[PDB]
Amino acid sequence: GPWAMALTPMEFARKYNLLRKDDALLDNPVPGEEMTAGIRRGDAKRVFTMQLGPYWDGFEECSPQAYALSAVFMARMNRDRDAANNILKVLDKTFVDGKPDFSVARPVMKKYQNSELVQEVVAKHAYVLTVIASLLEAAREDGVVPSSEFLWLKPVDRRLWYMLNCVGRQTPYSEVAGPFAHWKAEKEMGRRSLVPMIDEAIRALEIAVKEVRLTPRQMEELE
Amino acid sequence: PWAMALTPMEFARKYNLLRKDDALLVPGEEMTAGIRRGDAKRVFTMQLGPYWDGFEECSPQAYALSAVFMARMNRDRDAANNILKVLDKTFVDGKPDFSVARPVMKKYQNSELVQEVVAKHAYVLTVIASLLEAAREDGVVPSSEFLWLKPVDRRLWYMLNCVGRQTPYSEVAGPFAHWKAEKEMGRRSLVPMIDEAIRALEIAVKEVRLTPRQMEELE
């Protein structure tokens, strides 16, 4: 269960009771749109909002894994691969063994957290997830940083793993669609936002749900 | 969080291998258990896994990592890196593409150095252990280039992470000892040669003091 596939949009919507009878269609049927559910927008706002996670409030307050990965991407932003790789290898080796110390990253955090490029990112994003996404995107200015290199993350932190895997994708997994939409909104607004900006997640979920035909049993099952 | 390799004492409890060791036997050995030698033999025998019987008969994971290691034995880093790059990328998405190994398995399976390994090892696990050890004559090939194996095949992950190590994890002590035994005899052996794993488990269990709670349970 630490290693399941990402939920598809339809599976996400069923897992969180987000499907409804679509009464715009059920009172005004549109040709080429039959046998499709609608989405409960209010409940989806809640769900996407709860994916956003904690506000950024100093790197020392981050999770151990977010801390140590931020340090790597910092080190890369600042063009220091051996600090970056060294953290990658220690976490790799201790992943083979029982549990890792992310504490290997502390010296690199200390050295780069107040650096110009890191301070630009933190200025411009308000959530841990959206800070670190932007930190990954800047570290890929240096070169190659695939999610490969921190494969160990998926069982530790499913959400963080999916957020970081969608950096560079155009469409995110439904389980990180909230912070991804918010990250983009921050980027479009040119500032950090503490107010959740997750509407694009809802619109995309609606659309993805509209592309899937239900059976009649399934249509009657909608409330 | 992450599933840790069992210690010797946990391995021993999990397979019900501890036994009351009699009041007709050692100072400094108060509160220790003995081992059921027969039952441990059967557990280590079962860890050996299947006989090697053609590369087409291996699991998809074993097939592809074997293909990687052969490629390195024959010094084609690129086709080895391509496979690994491709299984990384691909595991990160829904399911890794083991089929990418197929071409590589076809090109080097009958090559001199692979044939020498296959000749000398009777088990899949002992074959691929030796394929990995030989792949390291080319360069560094850590289990860090195949982190994904840990959840796909735990046994194989543990076997391959033990190549280079002097003491194995208990969960692969059988095929580790067999592998050493075959390298020592200079031939493949179909009869399990797993006594070293029994002797190591006994030594390790004797270093661990039990509580009065745990001693009361022994037979």
Numbering used by the authors:
A (entry chain B): 157 to 379
B (entry chain A): 158 to 182, 186 to 379
From the article:
The T4BS secretion coupling complex of L. pneumophila comprises the inner membrane AAA+ ATPase DotL (IcmO) and two inner membrane/cytoplasmic components, DotM (IcmP) and DotN (IcmJ). In this study, we determine the crystal structure of the cytoplasmic domain of DotM and observe large patches of basic residues, leading us to hypothesize that DotM might form the recruiting platform for Glu-rich motif-containing effectors. Our results suggest that DotM’s cytoplasmic domain is capable of binding directly another subgroup of Legionella effectors that contain acidic Glu-rich motifs at their C terminus.
Further binding studies were conducted with several DotM mutants, where Arg residues (single or double) on the protein’s surface were mutated to Glu. Five mutants were produced: R196E/R197E (termed “M1”), R314E/R315E (termed “M2”), R347E/R348E (termed “M3”), R217E (termed “M4”), and R262E (termed “M5”). Binding was abrogated in M1, M2, and M4, indicating that these Arg patches are involved in binding of acidic Glu-rich peptides. To ascertain that the observed binding deficiency in M1, M2, and M4 variant proteins was not due to folding defects caused by the mutations, these three proteins were crystallized and their structures were determined and shown to be virtually identical to the wild-type protein. Thus, the mutations do not introduce structural defects, suggesting that the ITC binding results reflect an effective role of the residues in binding. The final model suggests that CegC3 is primarily helical. Binding is observed between the main middle Glu-rich helical motif of CegC3 (residues E155, E158, and E159; see numbering in Table 2 and interactions in Fig. 5) to the “central patch” residues R314 and R315, as well as between R217 of DotM to peptide residue E162. Remarkably (given that acidic Glu-rich motif-containing effectors represent only a subset of Legionella effectors), the M1 and M4 mutations resulted in a significant decrease in L. pneumophila replication in the macrophages (up to 70–80%). However, in A. castellanii, M1 reduces intracellular growth by up to 90% (after 24 h) while the slight reduction in intracellular growth of the M4 mutant is not statistically significant. We observed that the M1 and M4 dotM mutants producing the reporter fusions Cya-CegC3Cter, Cya-OSSCter, or Cya-Lpg1663Cter displayed lower levels of effector translocation compared to the wild-type strain of L. pneumophila (Cya-CegC3Cter: 50% and 30% decrease compared to wild-type DotM for M1 and M4, respectively; Cya-OSSCter: 50% and 40% decrease compared to wild-type DotM for M1 and M4, respectively; Cya-Lpg1663Cter: 60% and 55% decrease compared to wild-type DotM for M1 and M4, respectively).
